[PDB]
Each structure stands twice: as C-alpha cells, then as structure tokens.
Amino acid sequence: SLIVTTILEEPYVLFKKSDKPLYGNDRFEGYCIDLLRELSTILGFTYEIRLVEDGKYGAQDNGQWNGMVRELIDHKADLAVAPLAITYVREKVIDFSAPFMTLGISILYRKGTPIDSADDLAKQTKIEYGAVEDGATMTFFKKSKISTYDKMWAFMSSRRQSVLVKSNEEGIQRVLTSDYAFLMESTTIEFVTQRNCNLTQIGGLIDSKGYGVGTPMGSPYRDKITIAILQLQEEGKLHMMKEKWW
Amino acid sequence: SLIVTTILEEPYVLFKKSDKPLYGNDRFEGYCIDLLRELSTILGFTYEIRLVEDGKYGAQDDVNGQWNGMVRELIDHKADLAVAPLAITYVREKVIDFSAPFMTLGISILYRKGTPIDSADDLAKQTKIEYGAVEDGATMTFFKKSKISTYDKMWAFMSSRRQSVLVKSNEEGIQRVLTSDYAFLMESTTIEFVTQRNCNLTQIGGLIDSKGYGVGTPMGSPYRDKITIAILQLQEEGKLHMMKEKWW
Ligand SMILES: C=C(C)[C@H]1CN[C@H](C(=O)O)[C@H]1CC(=O)O
Ligand SMILES: C=C(C)[C@H]1CN[C@H](C(=O)O)[C@H]1CC(=O)O
C-alpha cells in the first residue's frame, strides 16, 4: 500500500459533499483523485490518501524543506498527487513524473480596466498585486532577472506583509474586494473565471511549467508513473478529466 | 566526453552554410544546437555531435521487434544523449529515458487556406482529400495506436494507402500539400515554422494531442535528472523562450 500525500485545492482535491459521513479515500474527489485512481488501475497499487499536515506544497525555509516535498524526502509518503509545480529547486531534491497538465503564471483581475499586461502593473503602484507566499509563482518573481518581473518583485517583497497571501482563496477575495491583481497559475485562473463572471485573466502566460506526480528521489515508481501519464495523455483521458472538473 | 546523437531538421538542427568547410561540432547550428550548448555549460560536460546513421527517429519494427534510429542508439549505448525534435511518447519511454520537455506541442493539420475542411473529423469522414504523415514517426504511431474512433478511422485510411499517403520527411509532406489535394498531419511547432514561410498554407483546427520534445538517454542513465534539472532552469530563466524566438 502506497501513502499518497495531497492537499485541499479545488478542483484538484476537495472534500466530497454528502449527508452521510464518508471515510478514508471516499472523502475525496477531484481531478487529482480521478488521476490517482486511473494510475492505480494501470500500475496495480493500492493506497491511502493523506492531507499534508503542515498544509504546504514544499519550499525551502535554516534550509529545511516543508510540505509535500518534505514528506517525499523523508519517505513519509510514496507519491505526491496535487497541483504541485515541477520546478528547478524542487527537482534537485525529489523526482517528478512527466507532467499531467501544463500551465503558466498569469494575472487575475477585474474586467474592463486599462490594464492589459504584466508590464502595465509593474509601471504603476495604485493597483496593488501579489501572490501566494513561498509558492512557485512567488519564487519565479523572486529569482527573475527579466526586467519587468524584477520590478514586480521589488514591489512585492517590500510590501510582503500586505500583498502576499497564504492561499489562492485569500488572493481571490483580495481581487474581488480591493484594487488588487493576483498573480496565480493559469489553470486555477480558468476555474475561477468560469465561476465569477466579473473576473478575468489578464494578458497571456508569463512563463511555462507543469504539474507532476512527486516521488522520493531515485524511486522506481517514477518512470512507471511517467509511462502511465503518457498513456493517459495520448488516449485523451487526461483531457476528459480536465473537461469534467472545469 | 559525451556522444550526442541528432538528425538534420530545420530549424532544430542544420548544417551551417559557408564556403570553407567546417569541422566537428562547428558544422551544426539551430535551436537544438543552442540548447545542447546551454546544457553543456550548466552541467560541465564536453561532447561530440553525430548524425544518426539510419536517419530515423525511433520506431519498433513490428515484424522482428528491432528498434531503429536515435532510440536504438541510446538502447545500445552507442550514444549518451539524443538532442533532436524527439517526441516523448509512451512506446519510446518504455525503452529509453527522457528529460522533462524543452518544448510542448501537438499533432495538428497542415492544409491549404480557405477550404471547408475544419477538423480531423472532416477529413476522416471523406476520402477525396488524401491525408497522411511521416512514416514511422511519432505522429503516424499515434494514429496507429489510437482507439479514438475518428483517429482509428484515419489510420484505417492511411495504412491501406500506405503506398501513397505516408511520406519520409516533413519536407516531402509539405510539397504534397502544395501540389495536390492532400492534408499533412504534422507537429504544430513545425507547422508554425512552415506557415510563416509559405503564405498559402495554414493549420486546420487545433491540437489533436499534447506532447513534448525531450532529451533522450539510455534507461537508468544518471544524466537524466541532471539534464532535466538544467532544462527546468533554462525554462524558468526564459532562455528556452528566447531560443524559440531566435529560430522562428
Ligand atoms: C499555493 C498554490 C495553490 C500552489 C499550487 N501550485 C503552485 C506550487 O506548486 O507551489 C502554487 C501556486 C502559486 O505559487 O501561485
Ligand atoms: C519525422 C519527423 C521529423 C519527426 C520529428 N519528431 C517526431 C518524432 O519524434 O518522431 C516526428 C514527427 C512526426 O512523426 O510527424
């Protein structure tokens, strides 16, 4: 039996709503749960789903790793199945399957302003902007030497206290209730904009990355999961699953 | 010193044009060459570029189970890396390893502008307009393996007309499109290069699937995750994007 570490994030993983109380794996549904189930069928493993205790994805603080990334490092889990960005920093410490979805950083804002691009935000200060603290998105800006993104980070880091948030939900509410643009992942933006008609992605994608299944470094499951993902992708299951949940 | 297998394909890999004949790695330029050089700098390896002898990418001979092309080179440890527009596929992954993708693309349709043909389904449900792909390439293999109804049907068509509608290069496919009533199934990245250069050609519909190109290594090779890590760095600092801009 595999321990599968995950995190609450709609529509990837959520508590299934029902009257009768649900137990163990039944409690969960979502794109990632469907994925996990499809993988389980192809590969022939059983599993226990567990929500990462510290509720973090995985960042380096003292140099300590946290979240689902730490769980894999310490062998406290076999797989991480969540919207976990495949990144340089994470890849040095864990392994990732080939990506099951592709995405990019982009901007969440209200409809019908003059704001048209990242550069439009960067060259002003009236409209505040930020991102989830210590997430892949934030780290991209923190490390970027592209001139526009450098400026944005200078803005964000200096207003760290007030513009950086602890979740996508927190960021979304900010956008809805104040003059604020949220830097978030395009896949999540798409879900949100379908459900709030007054909101909209601004500009295009700022970068490119994927979500992958995480495994402890050197794990034999890696390429097995990779092969499974490619199979699923080519036969259009991954696509149906996106269509289902979006 | 690493042995790097590759193949001539614009704008990924090409012979540098010059009066004086050039030697070794100097002979080559392109997106993939730039990539290889950037990887070499990050990882600190030296290398020798070699064009794959049989001039194939990699399919399994379905009579005798022999692999060919760059995939075969890696399997046999005749090379350390394959750097080319080598699609990361289910069948190939079972026999070699791939880095994380340096480019994302998908199968699409190259056709002439301003017909009623709008999708793969439109092609599949007729026979007047012929269609095909590079023989034994990733695109053909996708249709050959697909259980999607429309694609299954397309493969029935193609395989039975194997004689005449499957081609040996992108270039051959393109000439076909230009000079007869034919739609060419090819990779979207290549479509884009081509359409920028022939003003009467266009992409029909959207992407039929999604895949990446990755650097190939022999299974269990340690180079894998090193190269992957290098690719993620290059992707995150926007160098991969600049490189595409440069060559397109
Ligand atoms: C905090 C969110 C939910 C996570 C999700 N994926 C990204 C990650 O892998 O860290 C983060 C998005 C972001 O940083 O904007
Ligand atoms: C025969 C072309 C040039 C190659 C290139 N990449 C794909 C591959 O990795 O096989 C093939 C495209 C295709 O099959 O349409």
Residue numbers in the entry:
A (entry chain A): 432 to 492, 495 to 544, 555, 566, 667 to 799
B (entry chain B): 432 to 544, 555, 566, 667 to 799
What did the authors write?
The LBD is a clam-shell structure comprising an ‘upper’ (D1) and ‘lower’ (D2) lobe, with ligands bound between the two lobes, and the LBD dimer is formed by contacts across D1 lobes. Specifically, in KARs, additional contacts are formed at the dimer apex (grey surface), including a chloride ion bound on the twofold symmetry axis and two sodium ions bound on either side.
Consistent with this, we found that the K531A mutation results in slowly desensitizing responses with significant steady-state currents when either Glu or KA were applied to outside-out patches pulled from HEK cells expressing the mutant. Again, as previously described, the efficacy of KA is higher than Glu at this mutant, although whether this results from an increase in KA efficacy or a reduction in Glu efficacy cannot be determined from macroscopic responses. Comparing the KA complexes, R775A:KA was again indistinguishable from WT:KA, but movement in D2 was seen in both K531A:KA (4.0°) and K531A-T779G:KA (4.1°). Given the reversed efficacy seen in K531A, both this movement and the K544 Cα–Cα distance show a better correlation with efficacy than does cleft closure. Notably, the K544 Cα atoms are further apart in K531A:KA than in K531A:Glu, whereas in all other cases, separation was greater in the Glu complexes. The larger interface shift in K531A:KA compared with :Glu also matched the observed linker separations (and the change in relative efficacy).
